Design an enzyme around this catalytic site. Structure first.
Site, PDB file in Angstrom:
ATOM      1  N   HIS A  34     -22.065   4.658  10.441  1.00 53.17           N
ATOM      2  CA  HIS A  34     -22.202   3.978  11.748  1.00 53.17           C
ATOM      3  C   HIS A  34     -22.556   4.826  13.047  1.00 53.17           C
ATOM      4  CE1 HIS A  34     -18.002   4.560  13.522  1.00 53.17           C
ATOM      5  NE2 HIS A  34     -17.597   4.053  12.365  1.00 53.17           N
ATOM      6  N   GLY A  72     -13.243   7.416  19.280  1.00 54.82           N
ATOM      7  CA  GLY A  72     -13.887   8.789  19.013  1.00 54.82           C
ATOM      8  C   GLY A  72     -13.097   9.388  17.929  1.00 54.82           C
ATOM      9  N   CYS A  89     -12.907   8.308  14.735  1.00 49.15           N
ATOM     10  CA  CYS A  89     -13.582   7.874  13.577  1.00 49.15           C
ATOM     11  C   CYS A  89     -13.866   9.149  12.720  1.00 49.15           C
ATOM     12  CB  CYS A  89     -15.023   7.028  13.870  1.00 49.15           C
ATOM     13  SG  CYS A  89     -14.841   5.676  14.761  1.00 49.15           S
TER      14      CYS A  89
HETATM   15  C1  LIG Z   1     -15.706   5.966  16.148  1.00 49.08           C
HETATM   16  C2  LIG Z   1     -15.376   5.259  17.213  1.00 49.08           C
HETATM   17  C3  LIG Z   1     -14.483   4.121  17.424  1.00 49.08           C
HETATM   18  O1  LIG Z   1     -13.224   4.674  17.761  1.00 49.08           O
HETATM   19  N1  LIG Z   1     -14.613   3.071  17.341  1.00 49.08           N
HETATM   20  C4  LIG Z   1     -15.722   2.696  16.868  1.00 49.08           C
HETATM   21  C5  LIG Z   1     -15.961   1.838  15.308  1.00 49.08           C
HETATM   22  C6  LIG Z   1     -17.077   1.028  15.201  1.00 49.08           C
HETATM   23  C7  LIG Z   1     -18.276   1.285  15.759  1.00 49.08           C
HETATM   24  C8  LIG Z   1     -19.558   0.739  15.245  1.00 49.08           C
HETATM   25  C9  LIG Z   1     -19.536   0.177  14.029  1.00 49.08           C
HETATM   26  C10 LIG Z   1     -20.618  -0.485  13.554  1.00 49.08           C
HETATM   27  C11 LIG Z   1     -22.027  -0.453  14.271  1.00 49.08           C
HETATM   28  C12 LIG Z   1     -21.909   0.253  15.513  1.00 49.08           C
HETATM   29  C13 LIG Z   1     -20.577   0.796  15.998  1.00 49.08           C
HETATM   30  C14 LIG Z   1     -18.259   2.053  16.841  1.00 49.08           C
HETATM   31  C15 LIG Z   1     -16.988   2.829  17.322  1.00 49.08           C
HETATM   32  C16 LIG Z   1     -13.504   1.813  17.324  1.00 49.08           C
HETATM   33  C17 LIG Z   1     -14.115   0.890  18.420  1.00 49.08           C
HETATM   34  O2  LIG Z   1     -14.815   0.636  18.957  1.00 49.08           O
HETATM   35  N2  LIG Z   1     -12.543  -0.074  18.666  1.00 49.08           N
HETATM   36  C18 LIG Z   1     -12.654  -1.116  19.577  1.00 49.08           C
HETATM   37  C19 LIG Z   1     -12.288  -2.534  18.718  1.00 49.08           C
HETATM   38  C20 LIG Z   1     -11.578  -0.948  20.589  1.00 49.08           C
HETATM   39  C21 LIG Z   1     -10.285  -1.282  20.303  1.00 49.08           C
HETATM   40  C22 LIG Z   1      -9.248  -0.907  21.346  1.00 49.08           C
HETATM   41  C23 LIG Z   1      -9.728  -0.381  22.656  1.00 49.08           C
HETATM   42  C24 LIG Z   1     -11.240   0.121  22.623  1.00 49.08           C
HETATM   43  C25 LIG Z   1     -11.994  -0.442  21.505  1.00 49.08           C
HETATM   44  C26 LIG Z   1     -12.187   2.737  17.379  1.00 49.08           C
HETATM   45  C27 LIG Z   1     -11.452   2.553  18.549  1.00 49.08           C
HETATM   46  C28 LIG Z   1     -10.128   3.046  18.598  1.00 49.08           C
HETATM   47  C29 LIG Z   1      -9.685   3.552  17.158  1.00 49.08           C
HETATM   48  N3  LIG Z   1     -10.400   3.516  16.367  1.00 49.08           N
HETATM   49  C30 LIG Z   1     -11.727   3.063  16.308  1.00 49.08           C
END
Ligand SMILES: */C=C\C(=O)N(c1ccc(-c2ccccc2)cc1)[C@H](C(=O)N[C@@H](C)c1ccccc1)c1cccnc1
Ligand SMILES: */C=C\C(=O)N(c1ccc(-c2ccccc2)cc1)[C@@H](C(=O)N[C@@H](C)c1ccccc1)c1cccnc1
Lengths: 302, 301
Positions: free
Chosen positions: B41, B143, B145
C-alpha cells in the site's frame, strides 16, 4: 493508536555485555572502551556472603584471576579496581561497538529498559520503574547479576542501573554504574527489608491522559479538586505527594487533551475511593504508575 | 524470582530496518540479503484508499519510483514484484547485517516481540500476542507500517508479522512475510469487523503456573475437573477450548510445580465463576492470556 509497556531497542547494549568469572562465580559485565563493569560480589564465595570484607577479598585475587570472556573471545586485565560496589576491570582490547554512552543516577519514579542477561548473553528486554523505596519489580534468575538498566537519548545510551541482588520479598536492588546502591541496601546476605512501596502519583496521571488519548475515557468525572484536597486523599491510599513541578511536568498532556491537571486529579480521587467497579483502563484492572509523563509523550506523539 | 512481559533483544532486527518512500508515502521495510520487504500500500495516494487496484497502480510505477534508504545510505532498486500484500524490491546490495532468519506463519495465541519503527528508525520493543480474532493489540502511530514481529532462537530470527493497518477499533492488522493477512482483513479503507476475541485458555493456565512458581498460591483450590467439564465453563466465559496438545505442552510446568493440569484447570474455573474479589496474581487484577507455555519456561527456567 494503542498504548503498551515499550522498552528501548537493546541493540547498542547487546554489543556491550560480557561474561565475567571468579572460581565458580560467573555473572554478567558491561564492556565500555578499555573498562569492564560488574558487581564486586563476583569475588565472594558462599562462605563470605554473611559478612564479606571486600577490600580484603580483592587482595586475595589479582588481574589474572578474572575470566573477562566476551562472545567466545578472551580479554587481558591491565589493572582492576573497586568503585563502591562495582569492579572496573581494565582490558587491553577496547570495545569497537561502544555507543555514545553516559552514566546517570535516576530519581525514584523514573523508568528505564533492562536487558536481562545470563552468562553475558542478552536474554530479554522489559521496561521498569525505580519504585519510591528504591527497589525494582523486575524479572531476574541466578546469573542475572550485572544485567543493566538504560535509557536511549537520541544516539546516547544513559546507563542508570546494574542488577546485584534479590531481596527476601523477591523485588530487586542495584546501583548506578559508579557502584552506589539505590536505597539503603548493602551487598551482603543479611536481613534487608524495603520500606513501604508507595504509588508514583505523577505517573498514574500520565497514564490516564494516555488512556483519554486512546478514547478509553469513561473515568472522566463531573468534579474538580485542589492539590491540598487531592494530596490528603493520596496520603490515605499511600500515593506519593503531587507537587507543582509534577503539575507543570503534566503540562504537555494537559495541552493536547484540553483537560486540566486538577480535574484529572479529581477523576483519580473517585477511582481510589470507589475502586473501578469491575471496569478497565487500557486493558488494566488496576492503576499503572510505571509510565512517566516523558514515556507517554514518546509513545503517543512519535 | 519475578515475572514480566519480556521481549527478545531487538539488535539483530534493528540492522534489517530501512525506510521506503514512493510518491508522498513513507513507511518501514525489512532488508534481508538483496530483497527489501514492505507493505504494498506504499504505492497508494489519498485518492486510492477506498478501492485501489494494486495491479493497475504497480504497473504505473518503475524501479526508480522507489527510494530505499538504510540509515543515512541510499540503495539502488533493480527489481520490484508483488507477493499478495507485500512488495519485494531487489536491491544492488546484500545486507551484511542480515542475521540467519526464517519466515514463519504463527498461530492464534502465539506471542512475538514487535520492533515499532518510524522512517526506518527502530523506536521501541514490546511482546505482543496473535489474538483469536487474528488481530493484535499493539502500539502503532502513523508511519508504523512495515514494522515487524519476530521470535529469536539462539542466533536464528523468525519473522512472523508485518504491520499494515489500524482497524476502526484501534486494534492492528498485518501479514506474514509472504504477504498473507492473519484473519480476513484486506489492505483498503472499507468497513472491516474484527471477529469477537476469546481468551487464550492455555496461556492463562501457564500464567497461573508462573504465579505458583513465584509463591502466589491463594487461587489454588481443593477441587479437580475434566477436559469436558472445564471446556463447558471455558466456552461459557468466551475462553478458547483446552485440547490434549494444550495439556501435553503444560507438562514441564505440571511436573515442576507438582500440580496436575486438571487441578489448575479446576482452580481457573473457580476464578471464572467467583471473579477475583479485588485480589491480584503476579501484580495483575485480571487474568493474563498473553504468555504462552514457552514464554513461562524461558522466563521461569
Ligand atoms: C503506514 C501508515 C499508517 O500508519 N496507516 C495506514 C494504513 C493504511 C494505509 C493505506 C492502505 C491502503 C490504501 C491506501 C492507504 C495508509 C496508512 C494507518 C492509518 O492510516 N490508520 C488510521 C485508521 C488512523 C487511526 C488512528 C489515528 C490516525 C489514523 C495506521 C495508523 C496508526 C497505526 N498503524 C497504522
Ligand atoms: C548474581 C547472582 C544471583 O543471581 N543472586 C545472588 C547470589 C549471591 C549474591 C552474593 C554473593 C556473595 C556476597 C554477596 C552477595 C548476590 C546475588 C541471587 C540473589 O540475589 N540471592 C539473594 C537471596 C541474596 C544472596 C546473597 C546475598 C544477599 C541476597 C538472585 C536470585 C534471583 C534473581 N536475582 C538474583
Amino acid at each position: 493508536s494503542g498504548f503498551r509497556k515499550m522498552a528501548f531497542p537493546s541493540g547498542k547494549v547487546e554489543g556491550c555485555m560480557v561474561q565475567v568469572t571468579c572460581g565458580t562465580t560467573t555473572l554478567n559485565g558491561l564492556w565500555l572502551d578499555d573498562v569492564v563493569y560488574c558487581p564486586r560480589h563476583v569475588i565472594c564465595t558462599s562462605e563470605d556472603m554473611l559478612n564479606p570484607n571486600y577490600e580484603d577479598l580483592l587482595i586475595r585475587k589479582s588481574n589474572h584471576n578474572f575470566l573477562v570472556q566476551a562472545g567466545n573471545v578472551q580479554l587481558r586485565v591491565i589493572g582492576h579496581s573497586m568503585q563502591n560496589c562495582v569492579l572496573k576491570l581494565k582490558v587491553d582490547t577496547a570495545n569497537p561497538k561502544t555507543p555514545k554512552y553516559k552514566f546517570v543516577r535516576i530519581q525514584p519514579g523514573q523508568t528505564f529498559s533492562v536487558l536481562a542477561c545470563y552468562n553475558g548473553s542478552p536474554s530479554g528486554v522489559y521496561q521498569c520503574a525505580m519504585r519510591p523505596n528504591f527497589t525494582i519489580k523486575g524479572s531476574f534468575l541466578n546469573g542475572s547479576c550485572g544485567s543493566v538498566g538504560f535509557n536511549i537519548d537520541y544516539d546516547c545510551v544513559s546507563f542508570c542501573y546494574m542488577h546485584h541482588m534479590e531481596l527476601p520479598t523477591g523485588v530487586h536492588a542495584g546501583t548506578d554504574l559508579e557502584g552506589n546502591f539505590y536505597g539503603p541496601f548493602v551487598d551482603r546476605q543479611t536481613a534487608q527489608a524495603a520500606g513501604t512501596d508507595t504509588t508514583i502519583t505523577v505517573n498514574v496521571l500520565a497514564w490516564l491522559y494516555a488512556a483519554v488519548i486512546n478514547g478509553d475515557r469513561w473515568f472522566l468525572n463531573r468534579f474538580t479538586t485542589t492539590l491540598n484536597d487531592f494530596n490528603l486523599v493520596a496520603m490515605k491510599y499511600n500515593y506519593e505527594p503531587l507537587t507543582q513541578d509534577h503539575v507543570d511536568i503534566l503540562g504537555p498532556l494537559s495541552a493536547q487533551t484540553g483537560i486540566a491537571v486538577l480535574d484529572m486529579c479529581a477523576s483519580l480521587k473517585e477511582l481510589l475511593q470507589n475502586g473501578m467497579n469491575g471496569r478497565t483502563i487500557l486493558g488494566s484492572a488496576l492503576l499503572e504508575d510505571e509510565f512517566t509523563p516523558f514515556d507517554v509523550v514518546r509513545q503517543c506523539s512519535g
